[PDB]
Amino acid sequence: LLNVEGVKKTILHGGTGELPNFITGSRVIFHFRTMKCDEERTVIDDSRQVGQPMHIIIGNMFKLEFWEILLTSMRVHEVAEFWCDTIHTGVYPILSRSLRQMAQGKDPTEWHVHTCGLANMFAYHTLGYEDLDELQKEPQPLVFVIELLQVDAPS
């Protein structure tokens, strides 16, 4: 449980080793599920449900994006639960939208999608999914459960 404020880690399955080489430009490979902190612990996104593990790449190790903070605190095969206070979760709807887009084999590269995406948002005032929309308009803490599967060093 490393400290960074508004964030509570809880390691579930300890996972093996000596903390990987989280070098800028390493490729982090993982599954995650994200849930509300309600009674049902409602799921919102679950990479296992979409059938495949998520992948990010480390922009800069000295300037970590918030998700990288979480990932970088984990060993391979570790399974941890991260509670995150409302201050960190404002963006998640926009993230999720970007993930669900990626989930159908299309990239903000493709530029229709980046352009046409923004067009829909502005015109209709929606990220394109009710849950994400409800959640947008109802700020909230969340729980992420992440399973780190792999870290690979740069090309």
Short mmCIF file of C-alpha atoms in Angstrom, two decimals:
data_model
loop_
_atom_site.label_atom_id
_atom_site.label_comp_id
_atom_site.label_asym_id
_atom_site.label_seq_id
_atom_site.Cartn_x
_atom_site.Cartn_y
_atom_site.Cartn_z
CA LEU A 1 0.00 0.00 0.00
CA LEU A 2 2.06 2.92 -1.31
CA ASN A 3 0.67 6.33 -0.23
CA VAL A 4 -0.48 8.97 -2.72
CA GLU A 5 -3.73 10.33 -1.14
CA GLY A 6 -7.39 9.71 -2.08
CA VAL A 7 -6.27 6.14 -2.97
CA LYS A 8 -6.56 2.91 -0.94
CA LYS A 9 -4.74 -0.19 -2.16
CA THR A 10 -5.54 -3.71 -0.94
CA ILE A 11 -3.50 -6.57 -2.40
CA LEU A 12 -5.66 -9.70 -2.97
CA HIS A 13 -3.46 -12.25 -4.57
CA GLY A 14 0.09 -11.42 -3.78
CA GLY A 15 1.75 -12.29 -7.09
CA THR A 16 5.33 -13.17 -7.68
CA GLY A 17 8.66 -11.36 -7.68
CA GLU A 18 10.91 -8.32 -7.61
CA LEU A 19 8.73 -5.49 -9.06
CA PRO A 20 9.12 -5.26 -12.77
CA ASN A 21 11.25 -2.92 -14.78
CA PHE A 22 8.73 -0.12 -15.29
CA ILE A 23 10.91 1.75 -17.81
CA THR A 24 9.41 4.61 -19.80
CA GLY A 25 8.08 2.92 -22.94
CA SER A 26 7.57 -0.47 -21.29
CA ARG A 27 4.24 -2.10 -22.36
CA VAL A 28 1.98 -2.93 -19.40
CA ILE A 29 -0.50 -5.74 -19.97
CA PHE A 30 -3.39 -6.39 -17.65
CA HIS A 31 -6.98 -7.15 -16.93
CA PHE A 32 -9.10 -4.83 -14.87
CA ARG A 33 -12.65 -4.65 -13.68
CA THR A 34 -14.09 -1.38 -12.37
CA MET A 35 -16.98 -0.99 -9.98
CA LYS A 36 -18.95 1.50 -8.02
CA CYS A 37 -18.83 1.50 -4.26
CA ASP A 38 -22.58 0.76 -3.97
CA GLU A 39 -24.20 -2.34 -2.37
CA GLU A 40 -24.26 -4.41 -5.56
CA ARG A 41 -20.69 -3.21 -6.27
CA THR A 42 -22.02 -2.58 -9.75
CA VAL A 43 -19.69 -3.45 -12.54
CA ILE A 44 -19.13 -0.83 -15.25
CA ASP A 45 -16.18 -2.27 -17.23
CA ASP A 46 -14.50 -5.72 -17.08
CA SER A 47 -11.83 -6.62 -19.56
CA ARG A 48 -12.61 -10.31 -19.02
CA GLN A 49 -16.19 -9.65 -20.08
CA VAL A 50 -14.89 -8.15 -23.39
CA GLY A 51 -12.64 -11.22 -23.61
CA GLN A 52 -9.17 -9.63 -23.77
CA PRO A 53 -6.52 -7.93 -21.68
CA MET A 54 -5.91 -4.22 -21.79
CA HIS A 55 -2.52 -2.73 -22.77
CA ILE A 56 -0.86 0.60 -22.03
CA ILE A 57 2.62 1.99 -22.51
CA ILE A 58 4.56 4.13 -20.03
CA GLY A 59 4.69 7.73 -21.32
CA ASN A 60 7.24 8.98 -18.82
CA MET A 61 8.25 7.29 -15.54
CA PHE A 62 8.97 10.68 -13.91
CA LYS A 63 5.59 12.04 -14.98
CA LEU A 64 3.15 9.23 -14.37
CA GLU A 65 -0.42 9.26 -15.48
CA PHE A 66 -2.74 8.23 -12.66
CA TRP A 67 -3.50 4.80 -14.03
CA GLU A 68 0.28 4.26 -14.44
CA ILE A 69 0.68 5.10 -10.75
CA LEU A 70 -1.59 2.12 -9.97
CA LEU A 71 -0.10 -0.24 -12.44
CA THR A 72 3.49 0.69 -11.47
CA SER A 73 2.78 -0.34 -7.86
CA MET A 74 2.26 -4.04 -8.87
CA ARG A 75 4.21 -7.23 -9.47
CA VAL A 76 3.45 -9.74 -12.21
CA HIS A 77 0.41 -11.96 -11.54
CA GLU A 78 -0.54 -9.63 -8.68
CA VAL A 79 -4.17 -8.89 -8.18
CA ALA A 80 -4.90 -5.76 -6.30
CA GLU A 81 -7.95 -3.70 -5.41
CA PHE A 82 -7.59 0.08 -5.58
CA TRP A 83 -10.22 2.33 -4.04
CA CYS A 84 -10.01 5.81 -5.56
CA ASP A 85 -11.71 8.96 -4.25
CA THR A 86 -13.90 11.13 -6.41
CA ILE A 87 -11.05 13.49 -7.17
CA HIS A 88 -9.40 10.76 -9.34
CA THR A 89 -12.53 9.40 -10.99
CA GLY A 90 -13.93 12.45 -12.82
CA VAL A 91 -12.19 11.40 -16.04
CA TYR A 92 -13.08 7.70 -15.94
CA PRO A 93 -16.15 8.11 -18.11
CA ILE A 94 -14.02 9.71 -20.82
CA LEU A 95 -11.39 6.98 -20.38
CA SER A 96 -13.98 4.23 -20.57
CA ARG A 97 -15.49 5.67 -23.69
CA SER A 98 -11.97 5.54 -25.22
CA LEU A 99 -11.60 1.95 -24.05
CA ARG A 100 -14.98 0.83 -25.32
CA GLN A 101 -14.08 2.43 -28.69
CA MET A 102 -10.77 0.46 -28.72
CA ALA A 103 -12.80 -2.64 -27.67
CA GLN A 104 -14.43 -2.65 -31.16
CA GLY A 105 -11.13 -2.43 -33.13
CA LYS A 106 -10.93 1.32 -33.78
CA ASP A 107 -8.34 3.86 -32.76
CA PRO A 108 -8.40 7.69 -32.17
CA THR A 109 -5.60 7.41 -34.80
CA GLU A 110 -8.32 6.61 -37.46
CA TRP A 111 -9.34 10.31 -37.14
CA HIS A 112 -12.93 9.87 -38.47
CA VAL A 113 -13.37 8.38 -35.03
CA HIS A 114 -11.53 11.16 -33.21
CA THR A 115 -13.35 13.81 -35.27
CA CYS A 116 -16.77 12.14 -35.58
CA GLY A 117 -16.50 11.21 -31.89
CA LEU A 118 -16.08 14.86 -30.77
CA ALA A 119 -18.87 15.78 -33.14
CA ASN A 120 -21.32 13.44 -31.42
CA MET A 121 -20.23 14.51 -27.94
CA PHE A 122 -20.73 18.22 -28.62
CA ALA A 123 -23.94 17.96 -30.64
CA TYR A 124 -25.70 15.47 -28.32
CA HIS A 125 -24.00 15.98 -24.89
CA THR A 126 -23.21 12.32 -24.43
CA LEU A 127 -20.17 10.00 -24.23
CA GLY A 128 -22.39 7.45 -26.00
CA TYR A 129 -23.47 5.07 -23.18
CA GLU A 130 -26.13 5.60 -20.48
CA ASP A 131 -24.02 4.24 -17.56
CA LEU A 132 -21.08 6.45 -18.42
CA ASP A 133 -23.47 9.36 -18.80
CA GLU A 134 -25.27 8.67 -15.48
CA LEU A 135 -21.87 8.37 -13.83
CA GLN A 136 -20.59 11.55 -15.45
CA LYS A 137 -23.44 13.54 -13.97
CA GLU A 138 -23.12 11.90 -10.50
CA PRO A 139 -19.48 12.21 -9.21
CA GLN A 140 -18.27 9.28 -7.22
CA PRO A 141 -15.42 7.19 -5.79
CA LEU A 142 -14.68 3.83 -7.52
CA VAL A 143 -12.93 0.53 -7.04
CA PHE A 144 -10.64 -0.95 -9.59
CA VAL A 145 -9.47 -4.53 -9.46
CA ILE A 146 -6.42 -5.02 -11.66
CA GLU A 147 -4.55 -8.12 -12.57
CA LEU A 148 -1.14 -7.48 -14.00
CA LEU A 149 -0.15 -10.18 -16.50
CA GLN A 150 2.89 -8.67 -18.23
CA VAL A 151 5.47 -5.87 -18.58
CA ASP A 152 7.67 -5.79 -21.76
CA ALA A 153 10.66 -3.42 -22.35
CA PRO A 154 10.83 -1.09 -25.49
CA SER A 155 11.27 -2.12 -29.19
#
